[PDB]
Design a binder for this molecule. Sequence first.
Ligand SMILES: Nc1ccc(C(=O)N[C@@H](CCC(=O)O)C(=O)O)cc1
Ligand SMILES: Nc1ccnc(N)n1
Ligand code: NA
Length: 159
Amino acid sequence: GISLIAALAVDRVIGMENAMPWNLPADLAWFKRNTLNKPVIMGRHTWESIGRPLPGRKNIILSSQPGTDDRVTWVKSVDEAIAACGDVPEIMVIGGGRVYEQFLPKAQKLYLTHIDAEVEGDTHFPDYEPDDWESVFSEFHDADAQNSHSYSFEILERR
Ligand SMILES: Nc1ccc(C(=O)N[C@@H](CCC(=O)O)C(=O)O)cc1
Ligand SMILES: Nc1ccnc(N)n1
Ligand code: NA
């Protein structure tokens, strides 16, 4: 099935013009752990902020314009993105906001990191109804010497 994985501040904020004001290596380990050896679909702006192909994963970039890096797969529509994943057990949609909006109604699983931070952003994760989603996993973590904020990992499966 199709899964979304995202990290959210309060008010569903996921992005802004400048780098996010936090340092959460534990969330990136969580991200890597849950995306490895799966196709990852991302929008062009997410691709540019990552800056490199994510190793160990089939990288699929959505863009209206021709691709600029043959190390990854470039697609011009949501249907082309899905087609490029082939027949696999799980497809990982890793952002950004515009991409999440289009894939959420197709998704069966959400991997959400809830960050205890308030950040004015220009991009938000879509609003979802708890009645449509069962919380199957939830784990809270304090901030520590390596992580600037407290956070919790949650996995939801569509009802
Ligand atoms: N929006 C982002 C998504 C993933 C990453 C990223 O660097 N992920 C690495 C892990 C980063 C690290 O471990 O240093 C990976 O999944 O392989 C960075 C920004
Ligand atoms: N898509 C992303 C980017 C960073 N962190 C998580 N958990 N998901
Ligand atoms: Na899993």
